[PDB]
Amino acid sequence: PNEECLQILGNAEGAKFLSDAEIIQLVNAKHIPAYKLETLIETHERGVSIRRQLLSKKLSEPSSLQYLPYRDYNYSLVMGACCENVIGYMPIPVGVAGPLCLDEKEFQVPMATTEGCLVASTNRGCRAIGLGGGASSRVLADGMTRGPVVRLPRACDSAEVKAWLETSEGFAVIKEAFDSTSRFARLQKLHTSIAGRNLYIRFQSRSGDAMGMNMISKGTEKALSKLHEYFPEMQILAVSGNYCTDKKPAAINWIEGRGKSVVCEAVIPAKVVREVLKTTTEAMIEVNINKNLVGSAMAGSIGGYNAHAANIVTAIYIACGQDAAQNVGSSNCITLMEASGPTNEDLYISCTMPSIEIGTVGGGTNLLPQQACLQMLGVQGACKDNPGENARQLARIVCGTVMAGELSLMAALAAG
Amino acid sequence: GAKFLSDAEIIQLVNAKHLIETHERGVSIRRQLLSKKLSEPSSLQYLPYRDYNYSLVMGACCENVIGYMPIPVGVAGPLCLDEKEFQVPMATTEGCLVASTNRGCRAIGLGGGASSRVLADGMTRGPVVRLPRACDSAEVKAWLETSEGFAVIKEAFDSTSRFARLQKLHTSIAGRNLYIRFQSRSGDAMGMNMISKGTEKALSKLHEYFPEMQILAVSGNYCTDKKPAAINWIEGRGKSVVCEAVIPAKVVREVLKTTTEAMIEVNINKNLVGSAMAGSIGGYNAHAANIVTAIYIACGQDAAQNVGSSNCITLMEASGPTNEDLYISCTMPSIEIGTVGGGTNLLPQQACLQMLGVQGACKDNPGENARQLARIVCGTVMAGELSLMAALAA
Amino acid sequence: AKFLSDAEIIQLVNAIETHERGVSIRRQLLSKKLSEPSSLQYLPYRDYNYSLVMGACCENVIGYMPIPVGVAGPLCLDEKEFQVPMATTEGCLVASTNRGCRAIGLGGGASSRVLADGMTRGPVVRLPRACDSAEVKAWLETSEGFAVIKEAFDSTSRFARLQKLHTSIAGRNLYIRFQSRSGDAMGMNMISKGTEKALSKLHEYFPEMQILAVSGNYCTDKKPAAINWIEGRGKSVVCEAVIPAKVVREVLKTTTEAMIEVNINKNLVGSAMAGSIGGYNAHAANIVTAIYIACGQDAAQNVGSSNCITLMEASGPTNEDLYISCTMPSIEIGTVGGGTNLLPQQACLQMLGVQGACKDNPGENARQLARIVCGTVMAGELSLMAALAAGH
Amino acid sequence: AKFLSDAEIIQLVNAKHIPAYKLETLIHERGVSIRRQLLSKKLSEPSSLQYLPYRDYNYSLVMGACCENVIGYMPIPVGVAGPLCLDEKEFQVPMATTEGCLVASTNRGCRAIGLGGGASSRVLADGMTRGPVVRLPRACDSAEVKAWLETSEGFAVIKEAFDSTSRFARLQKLHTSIAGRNLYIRFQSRSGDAMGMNMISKGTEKALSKLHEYFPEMQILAVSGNYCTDKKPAAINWIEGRGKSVVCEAVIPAKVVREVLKTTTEAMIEVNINKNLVGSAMAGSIGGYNAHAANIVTAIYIACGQDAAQNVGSSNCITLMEASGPTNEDLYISCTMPSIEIGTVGGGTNLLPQQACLQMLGVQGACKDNPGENARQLARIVCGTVMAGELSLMAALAAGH
Ligand SMILES: CC(C)n1c(CC[C@@H](O)C[C@@H](O)CC(=O)O)c(-c2ccc(F)cc2)c(-c2ccc(F)cc2)c1C(=O)Nc1ccccc1
Ligand SMILES: CC(C)n1c(CC[C@@H](O)C[C@@H](O)CC(=O)O)c(-c2ccc(F)cc2)c(-c2ccc(F)cc2)c1C(=O)Nc1ccccc1
Ligand SMILES: CC(C)n1c(CC[C@@H](O)C[C@@H](O)CC(=O)O)c(-c2ccc(F)cc2)c(-c2ccc(F)cc2)c1C(=O)Nc1ccccc1
Ligand SMILES: CC(C)n1c(CC[C@@H](O)C[C@@H](O)CC(=O)O)c(-c2ccc(F)cc2)c(-c2ccc(F)cc2)c1C(=O)Nc1ccccc1
């Protein structure tokens, strides 16, 4: 009825003795507040069921959520960690491009997308590479960043703090405070910029196999606590002052790197360019120069000297539990093509991606389906013997798959 | 046919270099084939695949399919936008993102609501052609800028589809390269394939006037699609949108745990000065990409287009009788979006579109559903900016 | 003053007849305040025509700075020959540019085209709300709205002919980019006059509009900006030439294949790694700056006027000939007004056959000068790139 | 050749008895006169050089050093803006320009700064750069070279080869970027008081010679691969700095903003945010978050014998304005300029008229007891004068009319 239901709710034995309708009655009349539903209802799926039911009555079409699935999904690894106000899950089709012949190994790359032909095209690119003797890649740099903004009374004071951070002694003190927060914390050279009394400080460090935002933030907050002891008039405006730079386009990531900086390359014989890619080396180069270099230049691109790196980065990231919003900066790529061999008929190809933001532990990689795709690549979880090696390998795979994707689309655009 | 054989027998046929009548059994066999090639043969255990509607995916949205990836969906709302309320779905695995955005919606609702406008509408495709000499490409640019030249090109472009309605051309020369940016609305479709078809016919017509022209590529990165580029920021691409709200001083204190004065200081020195020092083009915001990407995954959009669709400048100012109220606006000139085609043909993705009342084509007013979804995106972005900026202020 | 002494006038102030004595007195007054009173010893000031400078080109004038002018030519451009003046203090610059001119000449000369023409100004206005700024953008975009604004703008001057508007919104800010030719003048003052009269007219339709500044940096004038690269500003120009393989080896001391390699990997890839917007060239700014100083241009406008993409590819039957092109979207320039009122810089404009207004075809002298700047830049690219390729 | 006449030498070249442009070796003031006379008859108007000055100017320091094929010189009017009250000092700033009202406006900016207790500046960083592109057979090999250059022992070997070419050559930390088999190497060092291009180029070439021993396969494609970056707009100069990075600031009392600048603190903050931050942002600027730094930079440079072409990057500036004081009524202003490329020795600073302008500011030539102090000081004057210019123009725009 209503009164009886509240007696049963407050009875230490609880909400599981009420029906869905009785609980909703109690919400509509203002006896139980919308937010408290999380702790009161026992099972996670039943919490989702009720939130959906409440939501449906507020929609102009109450049957809207019919085909949004929710049942029998492991919400235990999601509640309090990955999502709030959960009403179900969104299934994204997963496909496989491979084998990807990279650094003398073969990889079957999972790709989550709803764009027709993207996987097939990426697959034909892998085929060209494989018959061409495989690709090779190198991690050139490694370190996630966080770029807080502090304010001092005057610009002369901000300059003083900058000079202090650049002394051997001052940096060593900040480094100890940063490095004390974690096993993996290992602060690299600080990069700083002034704008008046503003001072942007870019902390960079490895972070084992995790993407590292949480870890770099704990090291950063304690590093600024130490800096405040030497400069007590300094104010910390924001733990992020956009100098990182995270999830926005920025030259600083392209130039300094962020996360993993990777280069990949292959040489495709003329015969493979002809039979797999249906074009010539000469035609490919002409398209690459005038589209990926000259065209991006006329559009005023910073870091966007590629055909569709973002397609590959986004499909792999969604499949592999990465933060897909980091496609903004992680897609940064320059794709170069030149003639190779004795008569300039073989295609040399390289992709350079200075800011791959990636990890195999933490965040979405804690969910089991996301982990199935990480296991396909042999990169799931933390590498105990060699910390960071799995995330490094996953970066290489992304760069190699991007190259495969650049090969195929460019050959398609070359013919017509 | 294949139904009279077992799994092991069909697999024997594939291994000897030599069809299946259900989509799901096709998926199963591909998974078994793939699993023998992996170092951990059990790695696919927790990748689900059963009972998914593969009939709308095969031959349309994905190839070599081995299952699906579940992304948790949460709701941020109610979002009070243009005298209406929306419950915004957000597919994400980042803890706190949905809660933070939800808090931004709460501040906006208590402050009277947000208001938005679509400022421009047209998807683009930017091919690169070339002529024997730069003088020749200059002749072609000139011809295209005459009203008679543009009219014959518009006639060719427009004949390919109902919604193909060529707007003003934008051209750029680099030596004998000519980059031509074609632009048009596309109903409620995002419109890539449609504009591509109009482009092919228009260039074919241009060749009749200029036979020495070579079409080097149907995209010469002048569009620009899925790469950062100032041209999308300055000219727009897809929907250009602005949203705004005024948040009373009291609400900023109670819901957001800061003050108007503090919000302004952080916005200016983070989203304007900070982004400036970082050398940003179009990234003058805190985390528009989090909300764009989450809404996109949930609503069947092309998540790769978060690259350009995330472009956003966030501005905060003093407001009201005593300058204690918080004016906020987000401006997003290049939201690339649609409610038909691509991932929006799938049923779960269509559930999230039905939530917002923007699913499929609007018959009475073509494009209105895609326009409305772009406004919701800009409003949900503004909500997400409100809260995170407030969190960073404290 | 005529009956007084240099010293008595100086004591009057502490406690004029001609311009040169006004300069002499200012120099002496200033020399008192310097730690080294004889600093101005070798700063020349005598026998300079100060009448055209006062109240027009410079204030508090203590003299003038001599910048060596050298000549690079002949430059065979559009079947004409040009002796290009270059005011510089950088050694080897004129000499290198000259070698590039010689290379082009032996390849049959350069061809250029003006692709677009219109100086801009980009005010920022504010409305009470973003919805009001959007209403104004929409109004400006209708044919009737644009026509009202065009009539206003065009009424201020005989050369004021308003082209298509370009606008951008940022909340309640609206940025409006006005564009028009301006005869042979660079045209900032003219464009500004037309802009303010047009904004006044816009205010009659939208009284709540606040005009924040007549430049809101949307122009964009004398700062690096992608809008100039993509939409253009002033004159947009392309120049090209084909250098025979024999000329590349003999005059330039390199090969076609080596030139293409250096250009791709320095001017495209290198500039791309450096995060350049509009700087896809070797040293356009050197040539631009030198011509500008010599021809009475606003040298500060070298910021955007130097915007350039230099391309090189194989040409001819053998694929051994060198094709070169420079594309310069935003050359800001004029042959009337400002520093081109002065007689010495007019001498340099007279060398080029472009001094003053073109009466038969207004704007044609400024266009011609922009073609010369782009051609001379291409010559400078040719030579510096050759020298980088051959490597000492 | 002095025993012949003008008309005779010209008759010899026209008749082709003597090679034309190989005559000024046999013949400086008269060498110019003959080049002009020969040149005038090739022109559509043979009297066009009439009013181009050439007599009574020292061409000896100019010939084979600053200019070639010289036909005269171009006078640029020089105004003075001052006193500029900067770091407890007072400067009279030479500004060579032909733009009306520029000197006057900058002057009003100086006047407001002086009446607000003056400005303060700091050099934040210092070092000229050169950014060659080298090529290895493969990206993997280019990666090898980048890892080697990053080891402390690889760096010291390169640092010793770099520092050997000059006493001022002190190589700072190397910055590298890979693009396939391309490696771009940004060499940076102080250069005393010189702007330092030729000096850094010397040390770079020797340094690459050393690197060529450890990796014989390396091709030096070009001594500049645009990674410096010199005389083109580039985010790398904005983010890393180049030449001198400098910051300047002052507080203008409210009353001074009203009486001298004819506006208010509130109006100035508003215009600055929406023009120099938001406006530049909408226009797609990297490094151009200012009103007209280029005007001031260009004018000082021309007057002081700097390379005016380097105004492209030297003008990079962000101008910030903010409420100051107890009632938020005073104006805080600051200009940050990360890439002022400048020098007081070498190039155009060797010419005497240019040296007079340098002497005016007390920075001509080398500072013997503190090397580089004169160029640093000039950099600070540039940034201070830029801030004066921003003050005045922004107030003019804020008021209107
Ligand atoms: C499937 C993808 C990878 N793809 C695209 C879309 C890429 C899109 O998401 C980003 C681009 O917009 C980025 C850019 O280039 O600016 C096109 C495509 C591209 C551009 C265009 F204008 C029209 C179509 C093509 C394609 C290009 C030429 C053909 F003649 C045909 C198709 C393919 C593609 O790779 N198809 C493909 C199928 C089976 C096997 C091999 C190959
Ligand atoms: C959940 C998200 C939206 N969030 C983040 C991550 C945003 C991330 O995806 C983009 C950023 O990297 C973009 C940028 O700013 O550069 C932070 C966060 C940000 C930066 C940082 F260094 C440390 C943490 C915060 C946060 C900020 C201040 C606090 F004091 C605490 C948390 C929140 C956040 O919104 N938390 C939140 C929870 C419940 C309710 C309300 C509010
Ligand atoms: C005279 C000028 C045009 N020049 C320069 C300086 C250009 C300078 O102001 C802009 C550059 O910095 C822009 C850039 O490329 O980044 C160099 C020069 C360039 C770079 C460098 F590291 C060392 C020297 C060269 C040069 C280059 C290679 C040689 F092996 C020798 C000289 C010349 C030049 O063109 N000299 C020259 C003389 C007679 C005839 C032909 C040719
Ligand atoms: C003398 C210069 C420094 N100045 C300019 C031109 C600057 C020009 O080279 C760069 C700009 O284009 C950069 C930019 O803002 O984008 C304007 C000017 C600017 C823009 C415009 F649209 C109309 C005029 C002004 C000015 C501005 C408002 C007034 F109401 C009047 C004039 C002055 C100026 O400083 N005048 C001035 C005179 C005596 C004393 C004090 C002050």
Listed in sequence order, the residues at least 6 apart from B208 whose beta carbon sits closer than 8 Å to its beta carbon are none
Angle between helices A118-131 and A309-319 (to 10 degrees): 100
Q: Which of B192, B190, B164 is nearest to B300 (CA)?
A: B190
Distance between CA B221 and CA B172 in Å, rounded? Answer: 12
**CB of A157 closer than 8 Å to CB of A233:** yes
Q: Which of A105, A395, A377 is nearest to A261 (CA)?
A: A395
Give the 3-state secondary structure of C44-74: CCCCCCHHHCECCCECCEEEEEEEEEEEEEE
User: Residue with structure tokens 């100035």?
Assistant: D268
**CATH of range C1-67; options 3.10.250.10, 2.60.40.10, 1.10.3270.10, 1.25.40.20:** 1.10.3270.10
What architecture is the D77-125+244-401 domain classified under in CATH?
A: Alpha-Beta Complex (3.90)
Distance between CA D126 and CA D370 in Å, rounded? Answer: 14
Q: Which of B65, B68, B56 is nearest to B34 (CA)?
A: B65
The residue in chain B having the minimum alpha-carbon distance to the alpha carbon of residue D289 is B276
What is the number of alpha carbons within 13 Å of residue A12 lying toward its C-beta?
Answer: 0
Q: How many CB atoms lie within 10 A of CB D90?
A: 14
Task: Burial-class residue B15 by CB neighbours within 10 Å (0-12, 13-18, 19+).
Answer: exposed
Pairing of the two strands D288-289 and D317-324? parallel
The DSSP secondary structure of A168-193, one letter per residue, reads HHHHHHHHHHHHTT-SS--B---EEE
**CB of B307 closer than 8 Å to CB of B228:** yes
Q: Is B258 in the pocket of ligand 2 (CB under 6 A)?
A: no
**CB of A117 closer than 8 Å to CB of A123:** no
Question: For residue D369, what are its two tokens?
Answer: 């007891």
Q: Which of B72, B74, B45, B67 is nearest to A77 (CA)?
A: B72
Fold of the CATH domain C118-234: Alpha-Beta Plaits (3.30.70)
Listed in sequence order, the residues at least 6 apart from A351 whose beta carbon sits closer than 8 Å to its beta carbon are A263, A264, A265, A306, A309, A333, A334, A335, A336, A399, A402, A403, A406
What architecture is the A143-259 domain classified under in CATH?
A: 2-Layer Sandwich (3.30)
Catalytic residue flag (residue D307): yes
Helix (H, G, I), strand (E, B) or coil at D59: coil
Contact flag B233-D284 (C-beta cutoff 8 Å): yes
User: Residue with structure tokens 């951008």?
Assistant: C168
Cα-based distances in Å from D260 to A269, C66, D95, D113, D393: 73, 34, 22, 10, 12
CA diameter of chain B: 81
Considering only the top CATH level, what class is A93-141+260-416? alpha beta
Fold of the CATH domain D127-243: Alpha-Beta Plaits (3.30.70)
Q: What is the CATH number of domain B122-238?
A: 3.30.70.420
Q: Where are the domains of chain C?
A: 1-67, 68-116+235-392, 118-234
Q: Cβ contacts (< 8 Å) between A303 and chain D: which residues?
A: none
Distance between CA B121 and CA C137 in Å, rounded? Answer: 14
Question: For residue D386, what are its two tokens?
Answer: 């830029």
Q: Cβ contacts (< 8 Å) between C67 and chain D: which residues?
A: 73-76, 302
- Beta pairing partners, C279: C308
Listed in sequence order, the residues at least 6 apart from B20 whose beta carbon sits closer than 8 Å to its beta carbon are B2, B10, B26, B29
Q: How far is C151 from chain A (nearest CA, A)?
A: 33
Q: Experimentally, how was this structure solved?
A: X-ray
Element (H, E) at D82: strand D70-86
Q: Cβ contacts (< 8 Å) between C169 and chain B: which residues?
A: 119, 240, 242, 331
Type of residue numbered D386: V
Q: Which of C36, C335, C386 is nearest to C187 (CA)?
A: C335
Burial state string for A133-146 with b = 16 or more CB within 10 A and e = fewer than 16: ebbbbbbbbbbbbb
Q: What is the CATH number of domain A18-92?
A: 1.10.3270.10
Question: For residue B323, what are its two tokens?
Answer: 């300058």
* Closest Cβ opposite residue D146 in set A140, A162, A189: A140
Listed in sequence order, the residues at least 6 apart from A66 whose beta carbon sits closer than 8 Å to its beta carbon are B351
Angle between helices D139-150 and D152-163 (to 10 degrees): 80
Distance between CA A117 and CA A128 in Å, rounded? Answer: 17
The closest ligand to the CA of C178 turns out to be 4
The CATH H-level superfamily of D1-76 is HMGR, N-terminal domain (1.10.3270.10)
The residue in chain C having the minimum alpha-carbon distance to the alpha carbon of residue B246 is C129
Distance between CA C268 and CA A296 in Å, rounded? Answer: 10
**CB of C98 closer than 8 Å to CB of C73:** yes
Q: Note whether B5-71 and B72-120+239-394 share their fold.
A: no
Give the 3-state secondary structure of B332-381: EEEECCCCECHHHHCHHHHHHHHHCCCCCCCCCCCCHHHHHHHHHHHHHH
- CA angle (D188, D191, D195) in 5-degree steps: 95
Backbone φ, ψ for residue B209 (5° rounding): -85, -30
Distance between CA B129 and CA B138 in Å, rounded? Answer: 12
Distance between CA A393 and CA A385 in Å, rounded? Answer: 14
Cα-based distances in Å from B363 to B358, B360, B366, B369: 12, 9, 6, 10
Contact flag B233-D318 (C-beta cutoff 8 Å): no
User: Which of the 8 DSSP states describes residue A289?
Assistant: I
Q: How far is D166 from chain C (nearest CA, A)?
A: 20
Residue ranges of the alpha helices (H) in C124-277? 130-141, 143-154, 188-205, 226-231, 245-250, 256-262, 269-273
Q: Which of C86, C70, C74 is nearest to C110 (CA)?
A: C74
Q: Which residues form the pocket of ligand 4, taking CB atoms under 6 Å from any ligand atom? A: C 121, 192, 214-215, 217, 219, 221-222; D 99, 101-102, 104-105, 108, 291-292, 295, 392-393, 396-397, 400-401
Return the C-alpha torsion angle A127, A130, A132, A135, nearest 10. Answer: 120
Contact flag B331-C170 (C-beta cutoff 8 Å): yes
User: Residue with structure tokens 């990231």?
Assistant: A317
Question: For residue A317, what are its two tokens?
Answer: 């990231």
Distance between CA B388 and CA A247 in Å, rounded? Answer: 14
Listed in sequence order, the residues at least 6 apart from A326 whose beta carbon sits closer than 8 Å to its beta carbon are A211, A246, A247, A317, A357, B289
Considering only the top CATH level, what class is B72-120+239-394? alpha beta
Catalytic residue flag (residue C222): yes
What is the number of alpha carbons within 13 Å of residue D259 lying toward its C-beta?
Answer: 11
Helix (H, G, I), strand (E, B) or coil at A311: helix
Distance between CA B165 and CA C68 in Å, rounded? Answer: 57
Q: How many CB atoms lie within 10 A of CB A19?
A: 9
The residue in chain D having the minimum alpha-carbon distance to the alpha carbon of residue C268 is D226
Contact flag B173-C137 (C-beta cutoff 8 Å): no
Q: How far is C134 from chain B (nearest CA, A)?
A: 7
Type of residue numbered C64: Y
* Closest Cβ opposite residue D281 in set B277, B278, B313: B313
User: Which of the 8 DSSP states describes residue A381?
Assistant: S
Angle between helices D102-115 and D373-399 (to 10 degrees): 100
* Closest Cβ opposite residue B117 in set C134, C227, C329: C134
Q: What is the resolution of this structure in A?
A: 2.0
Q: Which of A113, A85, A109 is nearest to A98 (CA)?
A: A109
Contact flag C230-A254 (C-beta cutoff 8 Å): no
Give the 3-state secondary structure of A36-102: HHHHHCCCHHHHHHHHHHHHHHCCCCCCCCCCCCCCCCCHHHCECCCECCEEEEEEEEEEEEEEEEE
Residues followed by a gap in chain C, C→N > 2.5 Å:
15
Helices (runs of H) and strands (runs of E) counted in chain D: 14, 11
* Closest Cβ opposite residue A373 in set B47, B130, B347: B47
Distance between CA B46 and CA D190 in Å, rounded? Answer: 59
Q: CA-based Rg of chain B, rounded to a whole angstrom? A: 25
* C-alpha A412: how far from chain center: 28
Contact flag A299-C230 (C-beta cutoff 8 Å): yes
Q: How far is D321 from chain A (nearest CA, A)?
A: 9
A106, A115, A176, A286: the catalytic one is A115
Fold of the CATH domain B5-71: HMGR, N-terminal domain (1.10.3270)
Q: Which of D337, D340, D338, D299 is nearest to D319 (CA)?
A: D337
